[model samples]
Target: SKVVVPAQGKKITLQNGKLNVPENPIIPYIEGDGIGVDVTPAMLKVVDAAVEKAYKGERKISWMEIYTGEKSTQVYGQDVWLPAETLDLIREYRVAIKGPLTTPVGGGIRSLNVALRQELDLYICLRPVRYYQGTPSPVKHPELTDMVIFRENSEDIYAGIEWKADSADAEKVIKFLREEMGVKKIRFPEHCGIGIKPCSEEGTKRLVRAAIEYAIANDRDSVTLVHMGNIMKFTEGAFKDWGYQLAREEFGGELIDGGPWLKVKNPNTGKEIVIKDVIADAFLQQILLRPAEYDVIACMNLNGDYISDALAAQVGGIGIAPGANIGDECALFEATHGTAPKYAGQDKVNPGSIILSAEMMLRHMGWTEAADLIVKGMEGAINAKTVTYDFERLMDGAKLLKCSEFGDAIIENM
Candidate 1:
C-alpha cells in the first residue's frame, strides 16, 4: 500500500450505504497544493480544537495524510498527479477532506479535483452559501441568501465529451452530424468545437433526490431545480422534468395548485417543502432580487458551476465558501476556492473555507456537537471583525489576521 494506516485509529467504514464512523476515525486528508499549505494546517488546528472542546477527549479524529496533485507527483514520481492508492484509500475509508489542489497547466490531468470526483462517483457537489456578519459583500442583503446548492457533478457538458476545434476528431464529429444525423445548424462547421451534454434521468433524479432529502432533513423551505431548459431542451429541460418526477413519485409530492411547481411534506418536521423550477437566467436574477425565496437548489453541472460561484460572490466571494463532493458511500469536502500560489506559505489567505469544510465534514460524520461548535467559532470570529486580509480590507474596523492567527481567533471565539 502506498499509504499507511494510522496506528491510533480505526478506518472509517460503510455498512448498508451509511457511514460507520469510529470514535477515533482514521480520516484521510490531502494537504493539497499551493496555498493549501497555509489553509490546511489552520483547518486541522481549528477542527482539532473544536473536537477536543466538544468531546473532552472522548472522541478525536485520527488524521492520516494522503497524497495527490503536485504533492502526489513528487511522492509517486513524475506524471503521477493522482495515484491509484489515493482513490483506493478514500473509497476504503468512506470519507475524507482535502484542501484546494492546483490544476496543472498543460499536461498530467485536465483537473486533478474533477478527476477525484469522477473517479469516486461523487456526483453531488454540495455548496452551502450563507453570510458571515462582518464579511464584505457586493450585495446589500447577503444574509438573505442562504442556499445549499446540489450540483450534478458527473454529467452534462462538463463530462468532457468535447472535440477540440479544427482537430481531426472535430472534423469527424462534424462529418457525422452532416452526413448521418441530418444537420445544417453548424454556423461554421469547418473548425467548430463540438461537445455533448448528457443528462441522464438516473443522474438528474438522484441529484434532485439528494437535494430534497437535505431539505427534508434540515427543514429547509424549498428545493428549486434551476436549469436553462428554454435553450437546451432535452438535457436541461429533462433535468427539471426528472427532478419534479422524483419529488412526485418518491416523496408523494403534489403539483402546487395546478401545474409544474410541487409541494411535498417533510415527514420529519411536518412542514411543507416546495419543489420548484426556475430558468437559469431568471434564477440568477432572483438570487439577487429575491434571494430568500429559495432554500435548496438542484441544477446540472454547467448551470451549477455558474450559479454556485455567483451565489458565493453575493455573500462573500469563493474565498470563504465551502464545498463537498458526495456520493452514496464516499465524500470529499474541500475549500471552494482555488490555490492562490502567489500567496502560498505566506500565511496571508483566509483559512475560513477549509475550516468550514471540516465543519461540514464533522456534521457529515454525526459529530454535530463539534460541528456546531465550529460554526459557533466561525460566526463568533467573523462577527468580532477579526478577519483575514480578504475581509479585513473590505470591512470598516476589522483586525487583519494571518491564516493561522485566524484559526486561533476562531478557537478563542469558541
Candidate 2:
C-alpha cells in the first residue's frame, strides 16, 4: 500500500514533463529521527515562515510528513525502518528531505541515509562551510572561511567492498596477493580478510561536473579537486584527473580565460557564465592558509567527508556546518553532522546545521529573499552573542541559548 501527501497551501507542483515540477507536487516522505524530532519541525516552520515573509502570501511550501525510524517501526513492524512504500514515495516525488537516522551497531542494518543516497544515485554531496558572526571559533579570522565542497557520493571505499575474515572471497584475494603478486609477511586474520575500492570514470566525472556547474552558476573563482593521490594513486588520484578533464571539456574557455570574469552569452538571454580546479591534499592546507583563493571543491567520498569536517572544525565546530546531497534533478538538505543521541529530546542542542541546511534548501527553491533573511537573521543572532552552549562557553561575552530558543530568535529577527 502507498500514501500520497498533497501540498497544502498555494502549491508549486512537479510537472510530468522534464525539468519543471507539477502545479501540486506530492512530496513523498520525510524521516525525522531522534534529534530530528526537534530539528525537523523547526526547519519546516522556518522555511514556511521565510517563504511567507519573502513572498507576502504569494508563494508557500506545503510539507507532508511521512514516518520513519522508531516511530515507523512501532507503527508498521520491526522490518519497517525503511518501508518499501516510503521508498516508492521518494521515487514518486524525486526530491525529499530527512534528518539523521539510527544505524544500529553490530550491523542490524546499514545507515538509512547512505542507503537512500546510494539507491537514488545522489552522486554529489555538497557541503558549504562559512563563518557566522559572533560564533566562538578557535580560528582567529573565521570570517575568511567560505567554500562549498562537492564530494563524489557513490564510489570510493563507501561502495561497501569487503569480505569477512574467514570468507572464501577473502581467501581468494589473499591467495592472489601471496602467490601471483609474490607478497610476503602478510598481516591478516591468519585466515583471511578482504576489501575493495572502486572508482569509476562515470562516477568521478558526474561529481566533478556538478562542482564545475555550481562554480559557473555561482560565479565562483575556482573549483578544487581534493585527493590523497600521493597514497591511493589509482583511486583518489584518478578522481583529481577526472575532475580536471570535466572542467576542461565542459567549461574550458570560461574557466581559463585571461580575466577573472569570463563572459559567455547565455543561450536564453545572452549573458556570460564562468568556471575553474584545485588538487585535493593541497586544498586542505590552502583552505586554512588562503581560503579566499578557492570557491568550490570536488572530491571523492572519503576525502569529501574528511575535508568537509576538517574545514568545519577550523572555522567552527560541525554543529554549525550545513550540507546537501544532490543529483541531476533532486536535492536533499541535511545537518552534515551525526545524530547526537545523547542530546536527543533535550532541546539543548544547537540547530544551526539543520537550520542553515534549510536555508540552503530555500535558496535551491528560488526563495532567495527568504534564504537571505535566514542567513542574515542567523548571523545577526550570533553577532548579538546569543548562541547555544557549545558557543556560549567559549566566547567571553556570549549568552547561552537553547535549541528551540535559537530557532525562535532567528524567526523573531526574520
Candidate 3:
C-alpha cells in the first residue's frame, strides 16, 4: 500500500492522546473548491506571518496540501469528490484547516462539506460570534452580539435521507404511507418530494452533552437549548428533552421554580450557570433584540444552520465567521461561508473567515501567542480602516484591499 505523503513537510503526529504541536508541525489544509483558490492561500500566508511575528521565528507551521472536492477530482480521477487517501490523511493528522468547498447545484453529491463531517463523525460544529470594534454593522450595538454556537454536526434533516421527486424510491415510501400505513395528511403527494429525519436520543444527547460540558469548561454564563420543538415535536422536541435529561443526570442540574429550565453551580468558578430552553422562532427574534442575554447556544442541525448565520449577520457577515467540526479524536476548522463559484479566482472576496479559523485552530493547539497575534492583527487592520471589499464598502474612509493584499495587510498590522 502506497501512502500519499506531503513532500514539503513531515506528517503531524499526536502525543499520548493529545495534540502536541512542535516548533515546526506539519498541518494539513484543503485549499477549497472555488474562491478557495484565492482565499485559502491568503489564509495560509497571513497565518504563517502571524506565527513569525508572534514568536520571531521561534515556532512555525509547515502546511501540506491534502486533496478534496474539485482539487481531489483533478488529482485522483474523474468524478472523485473525496478520495480515500484524503480521508486517511485527515484522520491520521488529527487536526486540519480547509477553505470553503462548492456544494453541487441542481443535482450531484449534496455537499462535500457535509459528507466530510459525517465521515469523520465530527459531531460538534463550533462557531464563535464576536464583534470586532470599527467594523460596519446593522444593529445599534453590534458589540453586544457575542456568543458561541455549538451546532450538532450530525443528524436531523442534514442526515441526507431524502428521496427525489417522482423517483421510484419516493413513490415506494409515499405509497406505503398512504395505502399500507393510512397516512392521509400528506397533501400534494404526487409531485411532492420526501425526506426522512432521524433524531435519536443517542445523537441528541451527545451533542447537548458537549454543549453543557463546554459551558462548564469555559465557565460561561449559560447554555440555552434552542429548538423548534414547539412544532417538530419528535425530532427537535426530543433534542430539547434529551438535553434537559443530560443536564440533570450528568451535571447535577435541578429545576428552577417548578419549571423546565435548570440552573447549576459551576464547579470551576462557583458561579451560577443556567440551563434554559427556547422555541427556535422566538429565539431568533430575541437574539437580535437582546443579544447580551444569551451566552452559549446548543441546537438542532437545521436551527444551528439558521441561528449561526443569523448571529453572524448580527455581528458582521459570514465572511468573517470562523467555525470548526470537532469530534473526540479529530478536529477540522474551516470558514463558515460557501464557495462563491461566480467569484472564483477573483482576489475580491474577504479571506477573514479562513484566517480567523486558523486563529481558532492555533488556540486549540495551545499556540496562544500566535492566536493572540492573529486577533490583534485583525483588530489593527479593521481599526486602521484597511479592509477587504466587504468592510470597505460599508466603512467610511476605508482603504480597499485585495484578498491577498488583506493577508499582507494583516501581516503588516501584526
Candidate 4:
C-alpha cells in the first residue's frame, strides 16, 4: 500500500460536496509540519472510528498519505515544500485533507497551501462556524453566530502576484504604473513593494454564483458579499458590483427596498433568498453585534481570511474552525489553525479543527450517518467538559485531556 504516487478514487462534485464516492475511496492526506505531526493522526483516528461505527462493515476510507511541506522536502529533495506529485495526486484523487503546514519565511512568505489552491484553481474557501453549546466564548450570543462562509478562494491579493521591495520586478511594475499609466500615487516607488489584487469579473462571478447556489441548495436565508469595495474601487468594489450583476443577469434577481439589496428566487425551492453587500469594517462589528442577521457569507479572498478567524473567535476560536478549499471538481479539507511548533508531538493542542474538517469531509462524501456520529461525539465530549488545554483554560471546570485522549473521549461519546 506504500507508493510514491498516491492512488486515485472516483471524483466528487459541488452538487453536495460529493459525487459518485466509492465505499472504499482512496482519500489522500498531508501530515503537515510541526504540530501537524500530532493533530493529523488524531484527525485520522477520530474519522476512521466514526466511519467504522456508523457503517459497521459496509464502508471504509482507504487513506493514502501524500507528501508536502517539510516532509515533502525530505523525500522529494530539500526546499521542495510543494512537490509536484503531491498536487498531482491530490488532483487525480479529487478529495483530500491536510494538517497545517509551516509557512515559508519572508520576504518570500509564499505558502504551499496557497500554491495548491492556485494550481488547482480551488476558488472557494468554505468554512462553517458554529458554537458548540457550553464552549467558552467572548460573545453574548455565540449560538446566534452560525455561518457558512463561501470565501472566494482564488483571485484578490491571495493571488500572490507580488515582487519584493528593491527587486527588479518591483521596479519594473513601479515604472509601468508611473511612466506608462501616468500615475502619481507612488509615494516612494523606489522602495515600495507592490502586490496586484486581481479581482476579475470571471473570478468574482463564479465565486458569487457558487455562494448563491449554495444558499439556494441549503435553504440559507441570505448570501452576503462582504467587501472593502467602497475604498478599493476597481478591484474590491467591482467584486461587489459584478456580484450583483451576475444575479441580475443570470439568476433573474430583482432589487429590494429602493435598490442595492437583491432577492433571487431559489431555483430548487421557489423561495426567495436575499442577496446583499456589506462593507468590510462594518462587517467586523456586525458579525459580533448582529450575527443573527447573516447566514451564508460570500467575500473576497483577504476579507474572508480575516472575517473567518474573527467569526471563529465569537464561537470559540480557530481551534475549531473546520475549513475546505474547493474548486468545482476537487475539495481539500484542512484545519485553519497555525502549526503551534512549541507543542509539536506533545499531544496538547485541540484536534477539533481538523477532526471537524474530517467530519466535513465525511459529509462532503455523502456519509451523513457517519458525519452525524462525529458531530454527536464532538458535542457530547464538549458538553462533558473534558477538552484540550485551549478549551480547558477557557471553560469553567473543564478537565484537561491530552489530544489523543480527547479523540478517545469523542469516540466514547459516540
- TM-score against truth, every candidate: 0.98, 0.87, 0.95, 0.95
- lDDT, residue 283, model 1: 96
* lDDT of residue 90 for candidate 2: 57
Best candidate (score: TM-score): 1
Better of 1 and 2 by TM-score: 1
By lDDT, the best candidate is: 1
Spell out the clash pairs found in candidate 1.
none
Candidate 1 off by > 4 Å: none
Model 1 Cα lDDT, one tens digit per residue, 1-414? 567778999988887867788999999999978999999999999999999999999998999999888898787887788888998888888888999888778783677788888889999999999988877899899989899999999999897888899899999999999999999888899779999889999999899989999999989999999999999899999999989989999999988898798889999888999988999999999999999998999999988989999999999856888999998768999988888889999999998889999999999998999999999899998999988898888889999899999999999998
Question: In candidate 4, which residue pairs get closer than 3 Å at backbone N, Cα or C atoms, i.e. clash?
Answer: 123-153, 229-237
Ten contiguous residues minimizing lDDT sum, candidate 3: 1-10
Worst 10 residues of 1 by lDDT: 103-112
Which pairs of residues collide in candidate 3?
Answer: none
Which of 1 and 3 is the better model by lDDT? 1
Kindly list the per-residue Cα lDDT of model 3 for residues 268-364, writing each as its tens digit. 8988789988899999999989889899999878889999999998887559889999977789999888788888788899999999999999998
Error of 3 at 134 (Å): 1.1
Task: Report the poorest 10 consecutive residues by lDDT, candidate 4.
Answer: 1-10
**Alpha-carbon lDDT, every model:** 0.90, 0.72, 0.86, 0.87
Q: Note the clash tally of each candidate.
A: 0, 13, 0, 2
**Candidate 4 per-residue C-alpha lDDT over 358-398 given as tens digits, one digit per residue, 9 for 90 to 100:** 99989878899999999999999999999999888878899
lDDT of 3 at 83: 78
